[PDB]
């Protein structure tokens, strides 16, 4: 479940997580992933747009 961020995204609140273009992240197998998916990086865990990331492996 390794992904890389395609575009910068800035958390606006509501358990969202900021990510940076090129950042590697892990998508947790959260039971409620959807248009948004729960990601994990060194800056925390939180929702990111599913269309802003792409799988790596």
Numbering used by the authors: 64 to 120
Question: Any passages from the paper?
Answer:
The Src homology 3 (SH3) domain is a ∼60-residue modular domain that consists of two antiparallel β-sheets orthogonally packed to form a single hydrophobic core. This domain is present in many proteins and regulates critical cellular pathways by recognizing polyproline-rich motifs (PRMs; Kurochkina & Guha, 2013). Three-dimensional domain swapping (3D-DS) is a mechanism by which some proteins can oligomerize by exchanging identical domains or structural elements between monomers. In previous work, the 3D-DS of the c-Src SH3 domain has been characterized and its dependence on experimental conditions has been described. This work explores the role of the hinge-loop composition by interchanging residues in the RT and n-Src loops between two SH3 domains: one being the c-Src SH3 domain, where 3D-DS has been described, and the other being the Abl SH3 domain, where 3D-DS has not been described to date.
However, the interchange of one or two loops within the Abl SH3 domain produces a noticeable reduction in its stability but does not promote the formation of 3D domain-swapped oligomers. Conversely, replacing the RT and n-Src loop residues in the Abl_Src chimeras with those from the c-Src SH3 domain results in destabilization under identical denaturing conditions. Notably, the Abl_Src-nSrc and Abl_Src-2 chimeras exhibit pronounced destabilization, highlighting a key role for the c-Src n-Src loop residues in determining the stability of these chimeric proteins. Meanwhile, the Abl_Src chimeras showed lower Tm values than the WT protein, and the chimeras most affected by the exchange of the loops are those where the n-Src loop of the c-Src was introduced. In this way, the ΔG values are the same for the WT and Abl_Src-RT, but the Abl_Src-nSrc and Abl_Src-2 chimeras show a noticeable loss of stability. Although the conformation is slightly different in the RT loop, the hydrogen bonds are conserved. In the n-Src loop, there are significant differences between the WT protein and Abl_Src-nSrc, but also with the Abl_Src-RT and Abl_Src-2 chimeras. However, Src_Abl-nSrc shows an ordered distal loop in most of the molecules in the asymmetric unit and this chimera does not form the intertwined dimer. The same behaviour can be observed in the Abl_Src chimeras, where the distal loop shows low B factors. Indeed, even though the Abl_Src chimeras are less stable, this reduction in stability does not allow formation of the intertwined dimer. Meanwhile, the behaviour is the opposite in the Abl_Src chimeras, and the Abl_Src-n-Src chimera shows higher solubility than the Abl_Src-RT and Scr_Abl-2 chimeras.
